[PDB]
Design a protein around this ligand. Sequence first.
Ligand code: 9JA
Length: 264
Amino acid sequence: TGLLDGKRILVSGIITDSSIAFHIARVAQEQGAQLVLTGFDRLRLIQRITDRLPAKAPLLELDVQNEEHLASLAGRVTEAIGAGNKLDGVVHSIGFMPQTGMGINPFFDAPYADVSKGIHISAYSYASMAKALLPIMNPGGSIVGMDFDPSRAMPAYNWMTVAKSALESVNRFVAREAGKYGVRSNLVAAGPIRTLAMSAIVGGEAGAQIQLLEEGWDQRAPIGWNMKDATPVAKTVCALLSDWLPATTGDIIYADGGAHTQLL
Ligand SMILES: [C][C]S(=O)(=O)N1[N][C]C2=[C][C]=C(OC3=C(/[C]=N/[O])[C]=C(C(F)(F)F)[C]=[C]3)[C]=C2[B]1([O])[O]
């Protein structure tokens, strides 16, 4: 018997096999969840990444900036899940920020056009997705998004930090809307993870300062932190997807090795 036995969950944000969403999807399927996966612009290549998952899963096209995609998403999911069946979970693992708003680039030199695009994708889309999917969610359901603790400023992450701050605020309002359906809405604030996205930033002064953040994180974390292992994060997301945190919503769960509770 698995944690998510007989639950229908939509997982978005799977770009590579190193994406956090892939490990969330992997662990979810290991725990008995029936999945619906979304992607964009490389569905042939994405499906082949998806094929490495334990179980087969339908793949739907979703650009969270496309209003037509969002307006038809709910229906397209139903034609895949089956009529009379609803979703029990939605995982939002989508974030983006142009180079000008991250890395070694001066914080002031990021034009708003780039920042607005990042915030649309990283923060506003969380509400867009909730708006589209809540009608086809069962009571007791769970919406989960991804987060990186933005309560304090930091190097390199720059404007992505701001987009995460907005996301945290958006989540609290999504929770108000989700409550009417009996649905919870939460974020998982993870410690630093070596996704291909972040791995690129490290290589592409800033990269050294990222290493300083990574090193300091593991030391600070009372139980340690492995940036190469996304599994503890994925299990945390699955925990929120289950029925074992049923009184938690509009909230943030920190899967960071306990680093945010330690100063030094
Ligand atoms: C899920 C996709 S996402 O786009 O929306 N996203 N959300 C959560 C999230 C959580 C942790 C992350 O890892 C880091 C690292 C990693 N170092 O190895 C370094 C820094 C810093 F501050 F040093 F630059 C920040 C986050 C990345 C992401 B994220 O921005 O990819």
